[PDB]
RNA sequence: AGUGGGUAAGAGC
């Protein structure tokens, strides 16, 4: 959470999205004090260095930066957005909401797979990438 | 008009607002009696720092 | 003393002799590898924020998470214990309206 | 043309550079570089880089 | 009983 870089106004978010030409921008929209946001923060920080080559991590507090809440439906406790060359990328996670990752994922390997699949799909010019692992079921048994 | 509606809602929510907030405060104090805040458990070491 | 380098054939003193050998056969591709190592080291980008940002982020979290910090225990996300920003809805039809609202937002 | 001539000239210049003896003593290298009229250290270069610079300077002259 | 978990992405007109 506190380790990852933080963006304070919407213009900084725009500059961060624009300035990345060959890396996928992963932005966590939420509140640093939210436990689900805390899980996203800890997972991202765990894999913030492994995927440095083909990704970058930014943290945005939607209370101090509400400028996207209307347009990006930033109302879930924690959402994850992927961008490539100033273009939001959708992921067919299987949950019915391809626009964002609105839930907390425990496994960092799953998030690394998601980021790599997003990079592969968006590099090829595609706008929607099929997630390697289905998420229509939590597989709890 | 939004201010008037909000004042209306606050006035109506004030039926037991003070009672239940006092109850919540008492329950919070009872819970913290045996389980202090995390920064409280480190306050002494923090001062020694 | 004076010794002849077996790889160079020059009269060199014995005091530096062993050292003269060590940096005598040094492979220039080692210099190349060191150069590429320092270039890739300078090619890194700060993945994590500096100390000021981390300290400020912890202060902000503490101001909100009173169940972990502070003295007064409020709810999970409350700090205690005019102008409202207008945001685009992502519709091209309202682009002009948002633009003129931002223009009116000027000082 | 001039392109082949210049690239060949640099080719044999490098070949000459590979076949020139330079002392491993840092002090003697510093004295030689000072005698040649060039600064000893180039923006905080390493001793190996200093030796390479001296070798190239000797090759050119 | 029941909603969903069933948006292909792209090009400018």
């Amino acid at each position: 959470s506190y380790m990852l870089p933080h963006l304070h106004n919407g213009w900084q978010v725009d500059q961060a999205i624009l300035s990345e030409e060959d890396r996928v921008v992963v932005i966590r929209f939420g509140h640093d004090w939210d436990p689900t946001c805390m899980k996203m923060d800890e997972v991202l920080y765990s894999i913030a260095e492994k995927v440095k080559n083909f990704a970058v991590i930014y943290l945005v507090d939607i209370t101090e930066v509400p400028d996207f809440n209307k347009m990006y439906e930033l109302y879930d406790p924690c959402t994850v957005m992927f961008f490539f060359r100033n273009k939001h990328i959708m992921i067919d996670l299987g949950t019915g909401n391809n626009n964002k990752i609105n839930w907390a994922m425990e496994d960092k390997q799953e998030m690394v797979d998601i980021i790599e699949t997003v990079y592969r799909g968006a590099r090829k010019g595609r706008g929607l990438v099929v997630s390697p692992k289905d998420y229509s079921t939590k597989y709890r048994y | 008009a939004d201010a008037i509606y909000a004042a209306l809602d606050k006035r109506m929510d004030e039926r037991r607002k003070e009672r239940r907030e006092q109850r919540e405060k008492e329950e919070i104090e009872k819970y913290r009696m045996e389980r202090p805040k995390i920064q409280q458990q480190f306050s002494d070491l923090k001062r020694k720092l | 003393e004076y010794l002849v380098s077996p790889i160079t054939g020059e009269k060199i003193p014995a005091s530096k002799m062993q050292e003269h050998m060590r940096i005598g056969l040094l492979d220039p591709r080692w210099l190349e590898q060191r150069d590429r190592s320092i270039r890739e080291k300078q090619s890194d980008d700060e993945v994590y924020a500096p100390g000021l940002d981390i300290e400020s982020s912890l202060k902000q979290l503490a101001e909100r998470r009173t169940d972990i910090f502070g003295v007064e225990e409020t709810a999970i996300g409350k700090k205690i214990g005019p102008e409202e920003k207008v945001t685009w809805d992502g519709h091209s039809g309202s682009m002009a309206r948002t633009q003129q609202a931002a223009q009116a937002n000027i000082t | 043309s001039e392109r082949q001539a210049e690239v060949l000239a640099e080719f044999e210049r490098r070949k000459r550079a590979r076949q020139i003896n330079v002392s491993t003593d840092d002090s003697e290298v510093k004295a030689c570089l000072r005698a040649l009229g060039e600064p000893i250290t180039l923006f905080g270069e390493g001793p190996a880089e200093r030796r390479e610079r001296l070798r190239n300077i000797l090759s050119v002259v």
Side-chain angles (χ1 to χ4, degrees):
Chain A
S1 179
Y2 45 92
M3 294 299 291
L4 308 181
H6 273 90
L7 310 183
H8 294 296
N9 45 36
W11 177 74
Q12 273 175 17
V13 191
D14 285 349
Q15 291 311 306
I17 296 169
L18 288 178
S19 80
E20 278 312 309
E21 182 36 79
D22 45 354
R23 291 188 302 178
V24 65
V25 184
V26 187
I27 309 188
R28 189 270 303 160
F29 286 124
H31 320 107
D32 281 332
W33 45 264
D34 215 358
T36 288
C37 275
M38 277 191 149
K39 293 179 176 65
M40 271 305 108
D41 291 331
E42 66 94 8
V43 164
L44 275 174
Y45 167 70
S46 289
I47 65 177
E49 190 54 270
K50 290 175 56 172
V51 303
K52 175 190 174 51
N53 262 325
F54 62 101
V56 76
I57 308 303
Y58 288 102
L59 293 195
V60 171
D61 192 1
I62 49 178
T63 55
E64 78 176 6
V65 190
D67 294 315
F68 305 86
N69 301 353
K70 263 177 86 86
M71 65 179 288
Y72 280 141
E73 292 201 338
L74 294 186
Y75 300 125
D76 278 319
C78 179
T79 71
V80 180
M81 291 305 246
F82 300 88
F83 308 94
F84 204 50
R85 283 94 63 85
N86 191 21
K87 187 198 175 308
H88 157 270
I89 312 295
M90 321 185 318
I91 312 99
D92 190 278
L93 296 147
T95 80
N97 189 179
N98 309 346
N99 315 128
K100 71 196 84 60
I101 303 187
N102 46 11
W103 84 99
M105 281 175 328
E106 186 185 3
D107 191 359
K108 74 174 192 174
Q109 178 58 57
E110 292 171 355
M111 181 65 148
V112 164
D113 302 335
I114 283 302
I115 298 180
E116 181 153 342
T117 318
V118 161
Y119 178 82
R120 276 177 166 280
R123 176 185 33 72
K124 293 187 180 190
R126 284 213 267 272
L128 161 72
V129 311
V130 172
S131 78
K133 181 189 191 69
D134 164 34
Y135 288 114
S136 75
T137 288
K138 284 180 176 314
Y139 295 100
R140 292 178 321 216
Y141 269 94
Chain B
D2 291 321
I4 290 174
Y5 281 113
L8 175 74
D9 273 334
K10 196 65 171 290
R11 161 172 167 80
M12 191 65 77
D13 193 36
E14 214 175 4
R15 297 187 199 183
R16 302 189 55 249
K17 193 254 198 176
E18 69 97 15
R19 308 212 186 225
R20 65 169 145 88
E21 79 179 1
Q22 195 72 19
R23 181 205 67 90
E24 279 176 8
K25 191 183 305 308
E26 300 277 357
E27 299 321 297
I28 279 173
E29 293 293 328
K30 176 248 293 182
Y31 181 86
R32 291 325 194 181
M33 261 285 308
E34 84 271 348
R35 200 262 174 204
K37 296 215 263 185
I38 299 195
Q39 203 207 12
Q40 288 302 113
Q41 293 178 176
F42 305 125
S43 63
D44 47 349
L45 282 72
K46 186 200 212 307
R47 191 171 325 109
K48 290 305 170 69
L49 297 175
Chain C
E1 302 178 356
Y2 280 102
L3 270 76
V4 171
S5 178
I7 78 172
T8 319
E10 62 199 6
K11 48 183 285 184
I12 199 75
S15 54
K16 296 257 266 194
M17 192 45 217
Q18 193 272 331
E19 194 66 30
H20 178 105
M21 291 325 317
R22 199 188 59 66
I23 57 189
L25 75 165
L26 210 57
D27 199 7
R29 67 183 180 179
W30 162 86
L31 267 163
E32 185 271 332
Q33 193 171 182
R34 197 194 81 99
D35 182 78
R36 66 158 299 287
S37 82
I38 203 68
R39 274 301 81 81
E40 69 194 358
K41 171 65 74 70
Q42 209 193 90
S43 82
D44 77 325
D45 293 278
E46 276 76 14
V47 64
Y48 308 132
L52 277 296
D53 291 331
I54 288 155
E55 195 273 330
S56 76
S57 310
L58 285 175
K59 266 200 181 186
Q60 265 185 5
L61 189 150
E63 283 281 357
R64 287 294 198 185
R65 283 310 292 272
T66 49
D67 55 347
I68 307 303
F69 309 87
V71 298
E72 197 165 340
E73 271 207 11
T74 179
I76 286 295
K78 322 299 167 181
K79 274 192 178 75
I80 292 148
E83 288 180 353
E84 173 50 52
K85 191 151 46 176
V86 65
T87 67
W88 185 38
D89 62 357
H91 276 119
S92 176
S94 292
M95 183 278 288
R97 302 185 190 273
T98 49
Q99 281 292 84
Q100 50 179 297
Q103 293 179 356
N105 289 138
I106 205 174
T107 303
Chain D
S1 184
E2 97 278 3
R3 51 222 171 181
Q4 286 81 231
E6 73 93 22
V7 66
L8 180 136
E10 181 285 340
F11 187 80
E12 278 91 6
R13 206 274 307 147
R14 173 68 160 142
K15 193 181 290 184
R16 261 202 312 284
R18 269 89 65 87
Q19 299 318 118
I20 283 175
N21 46 356
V22 167
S23 73
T24 52
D25 171 33
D26 202 295
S27 78
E28 206 268 333
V29 163
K30 282 195 178 182
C32 199
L33 211 66
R34 200 194 329 271
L36 294 174
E38 275 72 19
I40 290 171
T41 310
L42 173 70
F43 274 32
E45 61 165 358
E49 296 89 310
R50 187 178 299 110
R51 186 171 142 112
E52 262 186 348
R53 176 163 50 132
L54 192 142
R55 149 181 317 283
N56 308 345
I57 288 295
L58 283 190
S59 297
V60 176
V61 309

